Design an enzyme around this catalytic site. Structure first.
Site, PDB file in Angstrom:
ATOM      1  N   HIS A  45       0.805  -1.227   0.000  1.00 54.76           N
ATOM      2  CA  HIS A  45       0.000   0.000   0.000  1.00 54.76           C
ATOM      3  C   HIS A  45       0.842   1.283   0.000  1.00 54.76           C
ATOM      4  CE1 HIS A  45      -4.217  -1.558   0.462  1.00 54.76           C
ATOM      5  NE2 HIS A  45      -3.511  -2.651   0.686  1.00 54.76           N
TER       6      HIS A  45
ATOM      7  N   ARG B  42       0.983 -13.701  -1.788  1.00 58.65           N
ATOM      8  CA  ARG B  42       0.080 -14.356  -0.852  1.00 58.65           C
ATOM      9  C   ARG B  42       0.639 -15.722  -0.470  1.00 58.65           C
ATOM     10  NH1 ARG B  42      -3.049 -10.279   1.414  1.00 58.65           N
ATOM     11  NH2 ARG B  42      -3.209  -8.736  -0.288  1.00 58.65           N
TER      12      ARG B  42
HETATM   13 ZN   LIG Z   1      -2.308  -4.625   4.793  1.00 55.65          ZN
HETATM   14 ZN   LIG Z   2      -0.030  -5.557   2.406  1.00 57.19          ZN
END
Ligand SMILES: [Zn+2]
Ligand SMILES: [Zn+2]
EC number: 3.1.3.48
Length: 298
Positions: free
Chosen positions: A78, A234
């Site tokens: 982010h 992930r």
């Molecule tokens: Zn996060």
């Molecule tokens: Zn993250």
């Protein structure tokens, strides 16, 4: 006495959760140990939650508030994306253009409504995704960046954010690291206290590819990579890779939306950017979990 190491999960603009965690940590840890602690923030300071600006204000204040602590700020996916939109990422070291990062994900442009405002031409893919308008719930973009814009007092996707973000915050974003390495930290095991290496990285490390080669690009901050798996991955970054899978290296990450402790693998992201979930920190050597939702005293 072993140095106290605090690893802090994703904050995602939740100033109240950040404050309450910081206050709770000072009741769980005695004043001497706390004052000289290594504090590793695991990334994702922005998006989803409503008060990114105040979160970054808080983090900037920490060196002054606690001069004897060491403060490490990992870049999350982010925050990398945030920095990209602000044009704070160095040009790719290989001589390529930031626009070259778009091609791999070009078929995602329509659904994600990538930023086509001022300065989009010289912008990293993730910056354009971050400031995009997703066809519909997401907060503005696929990164939930709407609330970040709003916390700085501008509408989502506005080029005026670049003026609204203070210089100290831009400096904070520039000062983030993609990896942190420690030669010697203590951690409790079932057999007793151990000394270990530590690697802190937002999401984790990849299988197959040489670990040192990975750490090299991370240390250098290679902006020619379209999607940085070490920040955005992930299942591919969940496990400790083969080369480090020998019980001598702590691998700590946030990112995954779970609090998961498996031996030397520490995944500290109970919050997940959700408004009703706690932000957790792990305290080494004990491995005690401290939360904003705690009500601790000494
Ligand atoms: Zn996060
Ligand atoms: Zn993250």
């Amino acid at each position: 006495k072993p140095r106290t190491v605090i690893c802090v999960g994703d904050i995602h603009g939740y100033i109240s959760k950040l404050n309450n965690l910081w206050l709770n940590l000072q009741s769980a840890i005695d004043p001497s140990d706390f004052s000289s602690a290594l504090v590793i923030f695991l990334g994702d300071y922005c998006d989803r939650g409503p008060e990114t600006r105040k979160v970054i204000d808080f983090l900037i204040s920490l060196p002054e508030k606690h001069p004897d602590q060491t403060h490490v700020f990992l870049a999350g996916n982010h925050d990398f994306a945030f920095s990209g939109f602000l044009g704070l990422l160095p040009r790719p070291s290989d001589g390529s253009d930031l626009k070259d990062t778009w091609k791999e994900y070009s078929k995602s442009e329509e659904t994600e409504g990538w930023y086509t405002g001022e300065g989009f031409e010289d912008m990293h893919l993730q910056g354009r995704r971050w400031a995009g308008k997703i066809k519909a719930a997401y907060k503005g973009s696929i990164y939930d960046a709407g609330s970040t814009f709003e916390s700085y007092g501008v509408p989502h996707g506005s080029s005026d954010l670049m003026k609204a973000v203070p210089e100290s915050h831009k400096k904070f974003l520039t000062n983030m690291v993609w990896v942190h390495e420690e030669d010697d930290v203590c951690i409790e095991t079932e057999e007793g206290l151990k000394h270990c290496k530590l690697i802190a990285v937002h999401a984790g490390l990849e299988k197959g590819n040489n670990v040192e080669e990975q750490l090299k690009l991370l240390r250098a901050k290679d902006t020619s990579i379209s999607k940085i798996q070490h920040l955005s991955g992930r299942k591919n970054v969940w496990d400790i890779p083969q080369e480090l899978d020998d019980k001598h290296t702590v691998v700590v990450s946030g990112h995954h939306g779970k609090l998961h402790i498996d031996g030397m693998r520490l995944i500290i992201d109970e919050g997940g950017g959700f408004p009703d979930k706690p932000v957790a920190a792990i305290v080494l050597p004990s491995k005690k979990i401290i939360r904003d939702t705690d009500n601790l005293s000494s």
